[PDB]
Amino acid sequence: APGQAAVASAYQRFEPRAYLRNNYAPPRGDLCNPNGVGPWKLRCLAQTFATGEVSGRTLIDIGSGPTVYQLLSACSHFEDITMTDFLEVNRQELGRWLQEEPGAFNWSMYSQHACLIEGKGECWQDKERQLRARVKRVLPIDVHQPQPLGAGSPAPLPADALVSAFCLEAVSPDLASFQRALDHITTLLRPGGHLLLIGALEESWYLAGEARLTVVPVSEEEVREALVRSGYKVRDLRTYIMPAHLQTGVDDVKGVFFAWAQKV
Amino acid sequence: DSAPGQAAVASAYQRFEPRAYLRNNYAPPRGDLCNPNGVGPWKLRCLAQTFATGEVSGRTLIDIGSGPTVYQLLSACSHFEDITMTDFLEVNRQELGRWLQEEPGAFNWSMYSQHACLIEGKGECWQDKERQLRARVKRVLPIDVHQPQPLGAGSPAPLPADALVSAFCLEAVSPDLASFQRALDHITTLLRPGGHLLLIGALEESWYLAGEARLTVVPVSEEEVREALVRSGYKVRDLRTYIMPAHLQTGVDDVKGVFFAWAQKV
Ligand SMILES: Nc1ncnc2c1ncn2[C@@H]1O[C@H](CN(CCCC[C@H]2CNCc3c2ccc(Cl)c3Cl)CC[C@H](N)C(=O)O)[C@@H](O)[C@H]1O
């Protein structure tokens, strides 16, 4: 209870352009080295969709921030995609890239790299235009509320799949509120539907301009137990250890996990 | 071709010192079983949970590159009546011998025995666990994983084995990723079809200390390990990663984490 309120006000001085710079510009945002964090995340997402076993008509992205890369492979498989964030400054950053306003963030290195590893011969402009086409709305959300999108949100629940990258551990004061947030997102999921969850391993803080966020250090084992304790069969869970040269002064992340889990 | 690098491996290990090795890695801080997010506890949990499924049993088990260590068999001996231990260095097989016959001056594994019993939760005492391991270790043979027949021809070992266990062998003795794959393929000729393989190993490491021996290994990663297991005829049932914490990251090695693989041969 008290911790969930300190998270909320730390996130008030979250500078999205500073966030995008620390994590999606060089070095972490240079996609040329295939052993980097960028290529690893996109490969996880693409391998998982290329199986064919994750599909439907509706998808919800929990805690998108100002980022779109986590739906680049997703959007070939879902026609109504809902993106969500707690902060309006991020949804207005999401707005400017979906509507192609000036000063939108240049995501084309990531569209390029997703097209290359999907390997279906798709140019990146078609990938970007397909994502804008299928992303219907950009809604507020609070993963701590037992209903996270408000009483009667415009979103077509229950969704067929959730994507959530770097959200829960970054917004939860401790292991317990992280588990509750997972319980809360899971009610948004049609039973038998799929969760695709990316997050930081063993991280306790990261910087977003003037915001200094505190984060609950989660391990891969804690992540697996939390997915079952919320009723998922864990289909995949993989870890990326963070190389020295991607350890900048913007956080203390030690690794990144990817989870493919299916509601039971 | 890789035969030269394998010869440097052999050469370097002739400075491997068992007593010094054990102290760097199995007495505190690395061998601290009280810190539950330490690495010792994590490896034991992986083995004890895997065996607790009931899906890994049979008559014969072969431990691949045992070194002078036994923890990697502590949960396994409840399930296999015939255990084969193996190592490249006679001095290591002698260290095992010191422990098999209960000599003082052999290494004290009882902190590890006690932790395994505590984790298995069958209320067993650690002296029973040890007496059962000493009883079910039927032989300690030389092994070389770079040979096509790693135990040599017509060795004593009951072949083919029902399961294999290997802690930190393949990636620590392989000059490049190609001999690592070849070494995987050689040991899988000892495992019967449908048998299970339990692999523990270092992730992304290039040197470690085995007694002011600076031995230099090829770094591997999780996804390199998965692709090598499928490339050998295995379906991967579990692939877990332990990130070496900064506080256990001392001057012993440059290891960045540890992996556990449970795979089954088709
Ligand atoms: N109460 C709440 N309920 C719901 N959502 C809430 C609530 N409170 C805040 N939020 C929203 O949560 C989002 C959090 N993240 C950023 C978290 C930090 C990530 C960072 C950590 N350090 C390592 C590392 C990172 C990133 C990339 C790489 Cl590579 C590495 Cl290594 C959105 C990010 C985006 N999804 C994306 O994937 O980048 C914010 O937008 C915020 O507004």
Ligand SMILES: Nc1ncnc2c1ncn2[C@@H]1O[C@H](CN(CCCC[C@H]2CNCc3c2ccc(Cl)c3Cl)CC[C@H](N)C(=O)O)[C@@H](O)[C@H]1O
């Ligand atoms: N050609 C060959 N064919 C077959 N076996 C051969 C051949 N050449 C040599 N060998 C044998 O390979 C064995 C390897 N050692 C340990 C290697 C280094 C481990 C070290 C690395 N740094 C990270 C780390 C470590 C240990 C613990 C933890 Cl926690 C961490 Cl993090 C025995 C391993 C033992 N099973 C055990 O598990 O300790 C030696 O005995 C040697 O004789």
